[PDB]
């Protein structure tokens, strides 16, 4: 029930479902949350990925999100990220709403976590997580990817646009200091990357 104010007024979270800017608005609110494990000094690599079936990756090298059971809730602390709206102040709609509201409006969402020497993921149908958050293997690593396949039930067009893409990823390039920041494109095998140290 957490996400449904969401799915009952999507246009009041997101933006315009109709012109593209609602649509692109879903990449830079999952961008801005890695953007923040960077301002924490947790993160300096962000890698975007349009995928050949039309989804988009986002990729950090942060601390992941924690996997830990809050025995208040019954899941893990990663469903409640992605099942509840967070309590702090917030195209159009709403700017950083973050994950719970892209989770709410995607068809699909497949989350992966590296973290405590384990690799986690959980997948998400329209906003509900189709089994709990589970260990899958080991990693030397840290950092969260979020993949998400926009609903084509909210938003008239579902098709990314590599250009509206790049343009916000340099802003954020040059706003953010130390981190690189990558963008693929695999429908045409393009790879930008962004590194502003300063
Ligand atoms: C969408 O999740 C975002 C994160 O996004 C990414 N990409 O990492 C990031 O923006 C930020 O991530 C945080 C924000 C706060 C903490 C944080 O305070 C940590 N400190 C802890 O000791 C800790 C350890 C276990 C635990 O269950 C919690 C509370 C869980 C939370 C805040 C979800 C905190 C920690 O390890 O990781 C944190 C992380 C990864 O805030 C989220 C979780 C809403």
């Not at 095998?189 to 502003?196: A, S, T």
Request: a negative charge; charged letters at 25%; hydrophobic letters at 35%.
């Amino acid at each position: 029930r957490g996400l449904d104010a969401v799915r009952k007024r999507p246009g009041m979270y997101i933006g315009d479902t109709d012109d593209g800017t609602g649509l692109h608005h879903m990449v830079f609110e999952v961008v801005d949350n890695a953007i923040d494990e960077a301002l924490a000094g947790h993160c300096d690599e962000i890698i975007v990925t349009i995928h050949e079936d039309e989804s988009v990756s986002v990729s950090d090298n942060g601390r992941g999100i924690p996997t830990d059971i809050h025995p208040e809730e019954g899941v893990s602390a990663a469903e409640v990220i992605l099942t509840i709206l967070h309590a702090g102040g917030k195209s159009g709609g709403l700017h950083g709403v973050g994950v719970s509201v892209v989770n709410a409006l995607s068809s699909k969402l497949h989350l992966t976590i590296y973290r405590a020497g384990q690799i986690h993921e959980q997948e998400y149908h329209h906003g509900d997580p189709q089994y709990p958050l589970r260990v899958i293997g080991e990693t030397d690593n840290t950092g969260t990817t979020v993949r998400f396949w926009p609903s084509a039930e909210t938003f008239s067009q579902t098709i990314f646009n590599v250009e509206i893409l790049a343009r916000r990823l340099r802003e954020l390039s040059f706003l953010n200091a130390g981190v690189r920041i990558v963008l693929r494109d695999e429908r045409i095998n393009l790879e930008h990357v962004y590194d502003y140290e300063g």
